[PDB]
Design a protein around this ligand. Sequence first.
Ligand SMILES: *Cc1ccc(-n2ccnc2Br)nc1
Ligand SMILES: *Cc1ccc(-n2ccnc2Br)nc1
Ligand SMILES: [Ca+2]
Ligand SMILES: [Ca+2]
Lengths: 7, 7, 228, 228
Amino acid sequence: RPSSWRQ
Amino acid sequence: RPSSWRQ
Amino acid sequence: AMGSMERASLIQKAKLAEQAERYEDMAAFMKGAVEKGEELSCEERNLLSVAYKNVVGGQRAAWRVLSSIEQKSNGPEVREYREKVETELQGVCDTVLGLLDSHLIKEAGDAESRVFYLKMKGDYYRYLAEVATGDDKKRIIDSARSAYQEAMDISKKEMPPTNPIRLGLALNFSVFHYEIANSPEEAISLAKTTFDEAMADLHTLSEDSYKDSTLIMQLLRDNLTLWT
Amino acid sequence: AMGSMERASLIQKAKLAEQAERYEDMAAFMKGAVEKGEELSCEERNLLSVAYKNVVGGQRAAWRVLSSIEQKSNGPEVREYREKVETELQGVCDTVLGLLDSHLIKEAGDAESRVFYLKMKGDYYRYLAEVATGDDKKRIIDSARSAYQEAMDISKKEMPPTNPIRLGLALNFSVFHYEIANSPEEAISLAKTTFDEAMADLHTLSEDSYKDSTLIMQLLRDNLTLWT
Ligand SMILES: *Cc1ccc(-n2ccnc2Br)nc1
Ligand SMILES: *Cc1ccc(-n2ccnc2Br)nc1
Ligand SMILES: [Ca+2]
Ligand SMILES: [Ca+2]
């Protein structure tokens, strides 16, 4: 549900 | 490039 | 590899893998179900088709990316990796064609099942033809043509012009004509005649059948728009 | 399995697999490159991370679909298939953690490489924690915490507050606090302090570095908006 690191 | 059958 | 699992369990897990978008798993489950030796229901045929179409569809998309890079370049790495993906794609097509030949097609007596499997056989020979370059390329093309043609003959005799499998078969045979057989006029003629004869049969359909048929008719229309 | 291929060839093919969106292949190529025993460059570390994050990311998404179906239901098939996906996910996490332990982390002396690998170690223990239920769940959680904490300590000492790996590490440690450790106040405090200290350092950056940093700051902001 929350944003972890992504490109 | 053309469309074959798809769902 | 699925020999110890119940047929019903393989089918149930194929549906779960579809929900999870795990199409490799889905294909392996449905391969196991086919290898139980019983004929497949309408729903089960759809699961088999969806699973392998998604697996090979990802391989085809990757092969096209890599083939494009290879063409622009022309070390050995791009060619080697395109070859690796190509071999994996060919193995999946061979697996599907083997299921159809042992023994789905020979046990399929109803028009809906026999046309469904022959359309699959045409499709997977078409995917083999997309990557073919050697001495068997012409024979691969004719194997696709022959399978599609038998399916067309049955569908015209046994199915209404709006039947979704008849429409999808005609759509894909027209793509075969255009992209594989270098016969764009045949492709356009087949698409137009298929669309027009379906249009004239729509009045016979329920609202839900109407929706099923017009969806595939729109794909024929999209191709005619692209091609003319 | 990649022992006979040149290191440079494995890296080149990893980049091709990324272009083709073949992340399983990409991960296997980068595993082979790591197993050559040489340290990894900044670019190579990114390839390794991207490959495995995409592989495990698909497994996590499938596990969540199946876990949701299992919870609504509560035959053995849903549980069995969730377990199968879970075991495959755990195997991939174990593989990555093994690469970090043999011997990427111990050879990483620069802050940028050591923080990068310790953030990875925290991430893959976090993914193990997402599915953990047995007697080792608390130890898995503490292994993630310990790895993140060492990375945080180094990054605060050795990196500017806008450094993208420092920002991404803080983002993921905050997600760990919120989702795994049941510490939403710690999660929010870490995200706010990280964002505010990065904002005050933006004036030192070039336009391209500014873009890199504000991208990850927006993810911190998105979480704060979700959480408050
Ligand atoms: C090739 C193909 C496969 C399935 C279908 N379809 C759509 C809706 N019902 C059915 Br059968 N059409 C074409
Ligand atoms: C976890 C992580 C991985 C890479 C990056 N990143 C983005 C741009 N440059 C770099 Br290094 N941030 C966070
Ligand atoms: Ca029969
Ligand atoms: Ca070193």
